[model samples]
Target: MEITNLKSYKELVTLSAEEKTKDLKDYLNDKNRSESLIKKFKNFYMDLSRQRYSEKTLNKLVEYAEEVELKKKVEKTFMGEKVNMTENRSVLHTALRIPIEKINTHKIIIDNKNVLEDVHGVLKKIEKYSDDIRNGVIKTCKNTKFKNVICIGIGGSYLGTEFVYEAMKYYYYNMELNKNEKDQVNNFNNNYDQDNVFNVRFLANVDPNDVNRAIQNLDQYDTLVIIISKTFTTAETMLNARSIKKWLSLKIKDDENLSKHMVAVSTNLKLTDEFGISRDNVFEFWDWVGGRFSVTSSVGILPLSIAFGYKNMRNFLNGCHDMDEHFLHADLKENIPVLLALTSFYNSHFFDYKNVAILPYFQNLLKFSAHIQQLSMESNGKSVDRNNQPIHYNTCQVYFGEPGTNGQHSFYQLIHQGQVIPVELIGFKHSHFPIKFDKEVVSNHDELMTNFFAQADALAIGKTYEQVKEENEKNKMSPELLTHKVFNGNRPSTLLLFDELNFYTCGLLLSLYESRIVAEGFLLNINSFDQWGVELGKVLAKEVRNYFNDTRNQKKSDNTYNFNESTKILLNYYLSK
Candidate 1:
């Protein structure tokens, strides 16, 4: 049945019109609102008290979830049935994080083999390889310990891994400093690369500059490159890989030597072999894992373990598993991810807010919005429903933002005074690297937290016209100035507060957002796993590439290339440049 036909949805339609007009600030006075709406699970909490949606609104959202049988859909997804209908594969990225103890019983059978065995098998290999690389047991072609790794892949293969690797840098760098602090004096002058330091860089964009910059400073003999396309055939990934492969081959000048410099995370064994990567060097992740969600898989673990320690990466996966359990077992109303999705659904459906701001207070989390942007927008940004027909509803809010204090100075002014956009503000209780000064009133983290604590309330119960006038009572202002100072508060937002950022929390954050996307898709009746919309663009790009190919081949361009006049003019302008 269509969700529009649900009694609860009909009730919601009636309630939303009335609720939208009510003063959100008045709801804040009900102190129980904080206790009731600020949901807590494990080490994290999300405050929904600041949001405009009331108790009546939430009951309907939960009722609608029951109407759609969201729990059963969730169970089916985890149970490894084909939830990704168009692709005819299981949607169980959750399986990637199954605890070591449960590996035997947790069956994800594909082609007469329990996939859990394959998942764990690769994890073991990853740990051993990481240990080997870090311990200098595995040497480069020059018989020196590897000092750098370049990950060549894009979209799902790139964003999540790079972002998490960056987010956990504080932890890993601290570990690095501690591990080598004693050796600093002698190790510095002997050799820098010989020190127990490894740098991981991502090469995703296919631009020559991206390829050039990635390899320009690195020694080919000392750098290990990981190729991460599942098929070893993604155009951008392959092009980037080819560029790096050429660079390595130029230095090492041997197929065997080049192979030592390159390893892969791919399911296509034949392709990996063709690329001169041995079967032993090619790690495997199931087709069930989407690129965006594979951070818990070998796609992430392989490079991340080599750079950060394997233990930190494992802890990250454990955090993902913790969130998975929470999503699966917790009640719909109390479930953090489900509720998060529901509130988003409410705002999108009833309020007609097209944009959602992901304002992270922590600077390390600067890349996190892009990661969530890819996860949410790419997954649920669809108009067609499960019935393969056009649906009369909106789905997937436009996710955008920067790390805060930064965003506060930029787009936040629009969010505060312009058209209303719901904000998701995430802050930590403690900093990963706490900094303090003797002369300061507050530590750096405390200063950061003050902004985090203020923004959600500012968005919700804003500074009123009366308050602004009273502040300016010392010097009576013009009506124009008074209006300029006024804030029409009532903007809705949710604040996610965590104990601190860590491998576990990063994994928890990853899984929670992933679950939220899936839930949003389920509620919207869309197939979140498959992105058919991405296909048309790729198919269209080949024709465009042919036009560019003429220039590459040093031939005069022909306009007989069947493009629209607008596109042709744009292409001509670009070619002219």
Candidate 2:
């Protein structure tokens, strides 16, 4: 369906101009806000609590989905059609999570072999290796078990794994805390025992400081370095990997020990082996799996399995599979992903709000927004449609956010009073690391949730000039302060509440957004799977690096590299220093 052609957009624009928008406070009072807007899934509920849209708008969205055959598009994606036209590849990250028993029924065949079989094969490998490490079967050169893991990669390789690690770290922490075995409990309580627990660190930035910080604390011999690069040639990842190898060589002092300490997740076996990783230690995934969507693949599974056990990783995949099933089969109005995409599209097109803030109330989910920023922007940031022509309509809102109440102190002022920024507020009913504040009566989780709820409500039903003036008059404040205190309400936000944050919940959350991105891309007539926008920077970087390193240019007193004037000036200044 042509979203711009929809009558709802016209009506929304007219309504917005007339300033007749529904007041959220009045709407909440008149309607069953919780029952109507909140959708319950297996493990979480999506709260479109402050979404300032009408039933007519939602009906139009449903009609638009029907007109566009959204369900059929989703079916084509699941059936392994070449939905990613630019790449000539099927979008089948969903196939990566198909249960082994249902592999045949799913019928995802790539290169004359069932892709599910490959997925399961890699998963089994990951499981076996993780189990081996945990059970002390995989040992260092000194015959001690691997205690730490350092993952090297950039972009999806870094964000996805780091997000999952932070999100579920409390589970590991709580497991250790509640250990009843007296001998083990003491060691766990004092500090995490290297023999039983795993610590995973990530090196994503090209900055030398970031790489050094990731490796500085680790005993190189006892640390397993997982190098994740799909093509195994990413500049930042390979640079970090080479540096790490040199660091490990200094500690281990043997090339054989280096191979044992290093494993790679990549498609290039030749390159991985040449880089000193054994072929057996290199896990491979196909090109069909985009890096952003590779979390279900060995890219994320290997490190996650190592850190959080194979069973936990499996549960995480199962959760994503569940969401996938829901998105594939559910009706448009009831589909969580569909509604999210539709609402996002509506806000972007009709309201002309093209930025979304993902505010997760939980501290562990601080990196969650950063992950989705890449997932959303990299997937849908294209200006071109699937047909390789420029589209008139805007695609992909600028997704950004930080963890809240931290964000409340930082950006909430802008969201509340400045530009109309659409928000997705993520909260959980219970905190993973719950703590009592005063004699088991008050809990920090409750306080956090209170602020979470309060922020949404305040954003939606802001204080008017009259109310602000009244309060100020009662407090004997000046008239100048009255205008400053008045808050223009009706900011739009979507609240996603989880029962609790766990491995399964984290997977569900990620899948929900992934599906939403795909649905939105279909609606916008864009290819979400391919990211050609990022390649331009890589191409430019190579040329720039070549110019910097060319001895012929350096031999000249005044080097004249073929760069724009601004770049030439900057490069000359930089080179002179």
Candidate 3:
């Protein structure tokens, strides 16, 4: 299980070293060499264990890899592994979908008694409710309520479900669901008007303005809000939930009627009851299910089921389940997620790339970067290794990117013309929308694809100085203009091709990244779960808030009062105080 102990991969560095030299030589000479110089360079980079992944991260990854191997060797335990290390619990979120017969193997302990049975029971009810809502069978809240659905949660609560909801095609109607009824059918062709039937709003940020705006825009009678908090005690979530409840009470004139509109996705029934949400209105989520990975569970159920019927939501879960099974079983090399992790580790540790660019070609995938950022940084962005010793090396690469072609005009100029940086180029081989021609010669998808391929190609193999000179000669351009046109041809990029951009494929994409982070965590010898660094800033903020909140004016610290003349001048620009 130890990476160095892997006999098959022992000579990875040695094998790649020879190829790396040849690639550099060929790139300089512009030779039509048989092997790809880029691949050789990347392999060599991985082999050396460079600055990309911290030494601590590498060690932890090796440890986890060994643990996985040892566990496999000892027994054929199907499901219910105590995967969550921080909370000392088993993450069996998958049990929500598994049949009751198979669920008996694991100990169910969240709300006491059979956890899986409760999950199934809730799912059945949710399915019935979702169907009734979709078909206009049960209209509970208002005389003629708006069919809009809004989901409220931060971190894991929003990212997983939103990723799937954005990817699926059913929410975006490919074919008209009802020809007779114009408004009934939903289509997500554009972000501006997703879901032909209803609008979906997400309230994730703690910004008071966002909460105020969300409540202001939607009608209380028509809008249904899904409040997702595993503990029902997350400060920001509860604050926003309370704000919404207060807003609702004012509009409806009855405090008890909150259950008719709001549903809770949490395990803390007692806390929810204290907040005035009925027990029946609360849905149970397992403790083992980490918020980030709970998209397959009820966390994902609300938005996905609302946007694209419950059946499509099930398909999305099935897609993720397929990936989970694959992750549990696949070989290290051939596995997509494992390979991605290895690639990330190589760039981070060996190649010395401080940041990883996640450029997705699809505009709809604008949120993809944020999702990946959470998956990589939150999981592995640790200061300590598995042994709890402070790690000196880098754990997670700074992840940033934008939808393709758009970035080419923005930050890609720095990557292409300036210093080298490792980048991952994600684009679909086929777009969700097919190429269409009103006349014989017009093409939409083809043009879009051409631009995508061109961008990747440009990023990978840039224009040479000679090519720039030739262009200058042809156009009779000025010397400075030609100099600006020159590009170094050896910039590095990894191009990822998806078969299609759909809900299922999108789920696969996200799961793939999650698996990669797991592998990278193994490589770095770090626990991908724990995030203690975030707590320090929060504590500091609380202290600062106390100074502002109390009626007594707090004495300013001498360090804060004593400012340099430059600081005083800067402050004067804002206020005399």
Candidate 4:
């Protein structure tokens, strides 16, 4: 389908809150707001529960989707067409999840190479290596089983694995503790059986203190280091990788044995060999996979396979594949990601809402928002269109959020009355780790869900001034008290409910947001895959670092060294220290 003119479509269905007969609460209470609005998928569900709109407004969005031919663009993306025009590469992260048996059946080829076969081959290698680690066949320098793992990389490499590790901590421990009689150990030592459990840690930042703290308690002999860098030249990742190698040398002495404990997930075989990693241990990924969209690739699966099991990692991939199928076949109105992108576009173009709050009530999803912050903002935060010309409308919203009810005490105040910020609230029906009340056996999950439901409802249908005044009069309060207690009551929010937070559900959530970002980009007519903006800062940083390292050479150099006064002063001060 060809892209339609969104600017003209916005003027066609202009809406205002003043024209509505009922509020958000009234619309929610209407019997027609049932299963149709609440979309259900394989592992999770989404409720447009508290959006401040009506059936008429939703129909307009559906019409907009039809006019823009959004479904055809989605089809183009999954079929390995060159959607990312700026880089001249096909956005084929979806190919990472195609089942092994369906590789040849799908006919998924890129640049005359069968990408599905490559994906299947990488998964097989990852599964074998992970199984070897779990079975004690992959040992440390001292011939002992590795007890800990350190994942070293930044951005997508760090955030995706970190989120998965924390989200599945309960599952990992539960599985390991029930493995055998030897594994049924005590939970007192940090909620894990040390003998059977292999702990996973991360070193992402280039800060010396961050690397020091990560290795402070770890013995070099008992830790397996996995260095992930697609290009093998990321500044922060290489810095930490060198530091870790030096740390390992101090204890493991023999270079050959130390190489056994280190592996790499990169395409640079020459650099991996130079760094003393065995060629067999280096996993590879293609250049078509961008860093932010590479969690399903070897970038995340290798580390996650080591932390959890290969079977669980496969489940995660299966869940993501399910969402891919849903997005590929479902109708626009029934599609969760499509509807979400349309709603976001409507708010941006019509109401001028520039920020979206993604509040998840589950603590395990604390890093979920941060991951998406990079995903959406980096993908769609562009001033120019795909044709390299400036467009009039804004592209992406500022996506930020935190987990609740902790956020209720922090920023919910600003969202309630300060400005009209649209929120997407995520909740789960049950908790992974439940605590029983000694007195009444109350479920903490219920309390958390209560607050989750309450906040969304309150944000949508806040107390009116008349309700406040009546309560003030009944309690013998003055006019001043009632005036300060009034709430506007027209705020908007979308609720997403998950059945539970497992590996499969986590994968589904990730895929859902990835598709939403891509859909929004297509709707806005921007190149979502290319990240040229992130390169300018890195280039400037390298130039500044070079100056610091060779200040003497700068003094003897030609007079063409143009520097701003502020930069010169800062550089002088830093070099002096």
Order of the predicted models by TM-score, top scorer first: 1, 2, 4, 3
**Could you estimate the TM-score for every candidate?**
0.94, 0.94, 0.79, 0.93
- Model 2, position 517, has a per-residue lDDT of 92
lDDT of 3 by residue, 1-577 (tens): 2333454234433433333443222343443321222222111211111112223333443444454452252112224545445555665554555544545764354555667777777777677767766766655456554476768888888887766666553325553242222222222333434333666777887798878667766778887778898877776788888887777776777555657778888877788778777676676677766677677677887566766777766655556556656666765433556546665665555455678888877777877787788878898887776656777766798889888778878988888777667777766655544545466364554565676566545654567768888777768887667778776554456666666665566656666676567667766667765566677877665554554443145455332244468855764564435
Which pairs of residues have clashing backbones in candidate 1?
none
Where is model 2 more than 4 Å wrong at Cα? 1-3, 6-20, 32-34, 176-194, 439-441, 551-560
TM-score-better candidate, 3 vs 4: 4
Ranking according to lDDT, highest score first = 1, 2, 4, 3
For this target, which candidate reaches the highest TM-score against the unseen true structure? 1
Point to the candidate with the largest lDDT.
1
Instruction: Please list the C-alpha lDDT of all candidates, in the order they appear.
Output: 0.85, 0.83, 0.62, 0.81
In candidate 2, what are the lDDT values of residues 121-148, reduced to their tens digit? 8899999999998888988988888988
Model 1, runs deviating above 4 Å: 179-194, 550-560, 570-577
Clash count, one per candidate: 0, 0, 25, 0
Error of 3 at 443 (Å): 2.2
Model 2 residue 73 CA deviation in Å: 0.9
